[PDB]
């Protein structure tokens, strides 16, 4: 009477693996023999990256940029002398670093309007209320609404190779620093014929802006809501100490020859009200990215606390 | 004490039995109050309301819908059970009874009988109340009765009518020969009735148990009798031996409550630590409102003490996933779908009765694998001569570590021979008899108990107890505290190889089970029987088993599981119960572990934001972590996994001892899972924290953000928790392969689909290409692969170490 099928009688065919210490023992060697060459390789790769950090906060009174902590004229300029001991050869990437800056705060992260930055007409003049310490100014919607936009980093950094003592500038390109997908799809301009100023008509600039979003850059393909500097800043960071791509020093003789250097900064961004610091990072990359020994040290140590366990257990099981 | 007039002529309740618990009008208020008085259900409702009112990371629909589901499912199950009991109440009631009111044969319903009226029971017709036999129309004044519903035996007991009224037939018992029956108050003991009848013309005859015809007894071989209703329903001896059904909870169900309380304390500690650290951190003026995220005037005006409570509530909702509401939904589905394996089993099929196993409750499947004591009926259960494999089943149960006691309403001479035939009493087994021959009333039982415990057994022994002596031991156990009758007798019972209880009553059989249930430690008790005499002990034990035999289906309807044969209990416990317990015990542990692994990285993230309650993962990930990513593989495991093959489980009964005492849900196993989840959650967060200590993880120098960080953590977590279950799997069916690999492949496909299109129905596009950009870096791949292996290394080392020596 009860249907005699395999499923109803709990007799479906099954693999039923056995995994004991005669078939699981020999993977503590197979893993220790792959993880150690991998850790060693990705540890040598990281060591070969040339990198340098310059802190230009100017908090200590023996700094060229100490004059900009509380200046009289707001566009002050200071230059920090630094030396490149060994040359940078391949492509060089310039970053700016901020510490004690909580871009991951819950209140900060949601202070945007993704439909507005996607070029939606109904959202340009009606920004969301999640971006509302900075939603409307002067009875008028803010075109890049939100705290993330308002707090956009706005220092200008210039590199000069000394030599003679005649500074020669270094060509920095601002294109190609943001995600292709979020520059070409996620961030779009509002619709309008040819002029960007008349697309942002009933909107106003952010309160901390000194120039509207349609004057961010002269290139029409990098002008507003698609400025790569704006887009890079809009990508909020995970940790309160982070880096953001500033420029690209393209490979050409090394890209950055060893010698004396100048870092002319237009000190605009106040970070010292909170206990924050500002940095400039010059770095080369590899297939694995920037310089970080954690992955190599971890792979080496994981493939070394596996081979030793295998050795100490194969011997212990050979007593029989 | 009680005075009864025969025809209610000058010289109490009605017999409406109530076995149900809910009325139609009061079912919802009574069920929702008993359901929400449970800590888990109350907590779920509180969380649902907090998400609705104060704050929520995800929708408060994934929190309140499963609660609604489980509440309606339980309500429907209990309401259907109560309706089933109501249906039996209305067939016992509303039954035709003939009452002689005024010199005529009136026809009423069974529930309309009053104390002190003449009933007219005919041949092969059950008595409707506790009648006192006034007259059998024979000239002998003797009738024959089979009390198969009170003692389970089908012999013909003989009762005697009152001598001065043996001559009153022909509806003429109203001949102005009225009497006053002065009886005692109702008592549950079937073999003790005291009272007198005062027939007026006054002759005063002393009544006894030979005149009392009890309800539930069939009149046999006598055409017609007349009797007076002395006790009516809920005071009849049958109703006083009924007791009632209590809410049955399995050991897994009670362990789930302890696990939930521990995690409730963990959740409260997490929320309190986060709130305290948040308001310590905000004490610095530039930690809150550092000019780059400033508060509105409303947030600044919000009252200080109100905002602390709101922040605590928000941390509660943010960390609330560690008590999974999906676990209860999965448990209900698994329990409902696992009973079909008992129903479908061809080893429980009987050709004679053309029936198999019957499942009445699906909530006691795991209790079949935790049985410690078996209480058995003898007639119809153990015997037909003996049943098919009665001795082999008992040998298998003893080899499994269980104690088998025989509780029967039969006499000792025949009950003891059956125990000797079932190999329950061996040839070299010395019997300690506490029956009515060895006991000589008085306080000789005191001497007997001390002689058997203090100087005989505390240094082969089978105990034999009678119903009358058990009555003394139990009713006289609330007088002394220096040496308790009950404790002394229970020690002797525990030190005996087998215990025989003979000449018992239906309530005396549940009283024995209650004694064992209240020992030091909690033994799980099983009761098996075929008749209504065994209904009370079936309703009392942890698991009640009915038998579909020749005595009706009263025991098969009040039980949890019904099997045609007693030999069918070997497979029902050794294979089905073992598999059922092992599946659900693994499900509960895995559900807690996989949700602690899910939330610990998010709790560690608050130390790196400003304790701002910012979630580490996307809302679409938080929502479908327990719905789509990690829902099906564990459900398939809890329905198909055979850690030991079924054929092996039935062959070797000593494998039943490995899971005895809730072994898989004890402190050790629980701590193992809890600390493994904590270690894995710490590895998840900190391995990617140290990974994110570089300028860029890509060859093109571009940097990642707070959503890529969380996506990396989520990918590592999902793969680790799936591969842990894959490592724990021992029975790989095609369904197991399908669910385990399809969950992993569906995670990667939903990540590539959900992210990759700008959704017009979303107000945010935070995850547009986060997953696709994360997979474009070899460093991220290497980090994920390393973290999954580090997270499973303690597990691999365990399977390496405990599989040798
Ligand atoms: C007499 C009646 C007998 C009993 C009936 C048994 C038969 C069952 C019938 C079907 C009933 C359906 C159940 C309805 C319940 C809805 C629950 C639901 O979706 O809400 C979501 C719930 C709970 O979420 P959570 O993750 O714990 O987090 C909640 C937390 N409070 C929060 O804030 O968030 O999440 C859950 O409780 C979901 C877990 C259920 C798992 C099973 C369904 C899986 C869906 C299918 C898989 C998805 C496909 C992807 C995989 C494909 C690859 C193989
Ligand atoms: C570079 O970014 C700086 C930080 O966003 C920004 O400083 C901010 O400048 C705005 C505009 O002047 C100030 O806003 C208010 O300033 C005065 C009070 O000092 C008011 O009277 C004005 O009406 C205006 O609303 C912010 O106070 C100021 N914030 C800080 C922390 O200094 C610089 O202006 C930016 N420099 C550029 C764009 O060249
Ligand atoms: C850069 O700063 C130096 C100060 O050492 C100054 O001499 C030079 O004129 C500056 N150049 C520019 C372009 O501002
Ligand atoms: F043998 Al019985 F009650 F004792 F069915």
PDB file of C-alpha atoms and ligand atoms in Angstrom, chain A residues 74 150-152 154-155 207-211 268-270 273, chain B residues 291, ligand 2:
ATOM      1  CA  UNK A  74      42.142  81.948   2.768  1.00  0.00           C
ATOM      2  CA  UNK A 150      29.395  69.387   0.597  1.00  0.00           C
ATOM      3  CA  UNK A 151      32.539  68.080   2.290  1.00  0.00           C
ATOM      4  CA  UNK A 152      34.390  67.469  -0.999  1.00  0.00           C
ATOM      5  CA  UNK A 154      39.413  70.810  -2.431  1.00  0.00           C
ATOM      6  CA  UNK A 155      43.175  71.157  -1.973  1.00  0.00           C
ATOM      7  CA  UNK A 207      27.133  75.985   0.684  1.00  0.00           C
ATOM      8  CA  UNK A 208      30.837  75.096   0.921  1.00  0.00           C
ATOM      9  CA  UNK A 209      31.238  75.389  -2.868  1.00  0.00           C
ATOM     10  CA  UNK A 210      33.003  78.429  -4.288  1.00  0.00           C
ATOM     11  CA  UNK A 211      31.920  77.583  -7.866  1.00  0.00           C
ATOM     12  CA  UNK A 268      41.983  74.872   1.315  1.00  0.00           C
ATOM     13  CA  UNK A 269      40.641  71.885   3.288  1.00  0.00           C
ATOM     14  CA  UNK A 270      40.359  72.322   7.076  1.00  0.00           C
ATOM     15  CA  UNK A 273      39.254  71.325  13.673  1.00  0.00           C
TER      16      UNK A 273
ATOM     17  CA  UNK B 291      31.467  70.181  10.167  1.00  0.00           C
TER      18      UNK B 291
HETATM   19  C1  LIG C   2      37.382  74.187   0.592  1.00  0.00           C
HETATM   20  O1  LIG C   2      36.524  73.450   1.467  1.00  0.00           O
HETATM   21  C2  LIG C   2      36.327  74.065   2.747  1.00  0.00           C
HETATM   22  C3  LIG C   2      35.511  73.102   3.574  1.00  0.00           C
HETATM   23  O2  LIG C   2      34.331  72.700   2.893  1.00  0.00           O
HETATM   24  C4  LIG C   2      35.653  75.419   2.562  1.00  0.00           C
HETATM   25  O3  LIG C   2      35.502  76.047   3.829  1.00  0.00           O
HETATM   26  C5  LIG C   2      34.124  76.436   4.005  1.00  0.00           C
HETATM   27  O4  LIG C   2      33.823  77.576   3.214  1.00  0.00           O
HETATM   28  C6  LIG C   2      32.447  77.969   3.295  1.00  0.00           C
HETATM   29  C7  LIG C   2      32.259  79.100   2.313  1.00  0.00           C
HETATM   30  O5  LIG C   2      32.955  80.267   2.728  1.00  0.00           O
HETATM   31  C8  LIG C   2      32.095  78.360   4.729  1.00  0.00           C
HETATM   32  O6  LIG C   2      30.688  78.572   4.783  1.00  0.00           O
HETATM   33  C9  LIG C   2      30.331  79.802   5.452  1.00  0.00           C
HETATM   34  O7  LIG C   2      31.466  80.594   5.782  1.00  0.00           O
HETATM   35  C10 LIG C   2      31.201  81.845   6.496  1.00  0.00           C
HETATM   36  C11 LIG C   2      31.565  81.640   7.956  1.00  0.00           C
HETATM   37  O8  LIG C   2      32.977  81.490   8.044  1.00  0.00           O
HETATM   38  C12 LIG C   2      29.743  82.296   6.287  1.00  0.00           C
HETATM   39  O9  LIG C   2      29.630  83.674   6.596  1.00  0.00           O
HETATM   40  C13 LIG C   2      29.344  82.053   4.830  1.00  0.00           C
HETATM   41  O10 LIG C   2      28.076  82.643   4.557  1.00  0.00           O
HETATM   42  C14 LIG C   2      29.362  80.557   4.502  1.00  0.00           C
HETATM   43  O11 LIG C   2      28.017  80.100   4.650  1.00  0.00           O
HETATM   44  C15 LIG C   2      32.464  77.246   5.701  1.00  0.00           C
HETATM   45  O12 LIG C   2      32.333  77.711   7.040  1.00  0.00           O
HETATM   46  C16 LIG C   2      33.897  76.766   5.480  1.00  0.00           C
HETATM   47  N1  LIG C   2      34.177  75.610   6.317  1.00  0.00           N
HETATM   48  C17 LIG C   2      35.313  75.458   7.004  1.00  0.00           C
HETATM   49  C18 LIG C   2      35.425  74.203   7.814  1.00  0.00           C
HETATM   50  O13 LIG C   2      36.209  76.294   6.974  1.00  0.00           O
HETATM   51  C19 LIG C   2      36.498  76.292   1.645  1.00  0.00           C
HETATM   52  O14 LIG C   2      35.815  77.509   1.371  1.00  0.00           O
HETATM   53  C20 LIG C   2      36.786  75.572   0.329  1.00  0.00           C
HETATM   54  N2  LIG C   2      37.679  76.367  -0.501  1.00  0.00           N
HETATM   55  C21 LIG C   2      37.493  76.568  -1.810  1.00  0.00           C
HETATM   56  C22 LIG C   2      36.281  75.922  -2.414  1.00  0.00           C
HETATM   57  O15 LIG C   2      38.269  77.243  -2.477  1.00  0.00           O
END
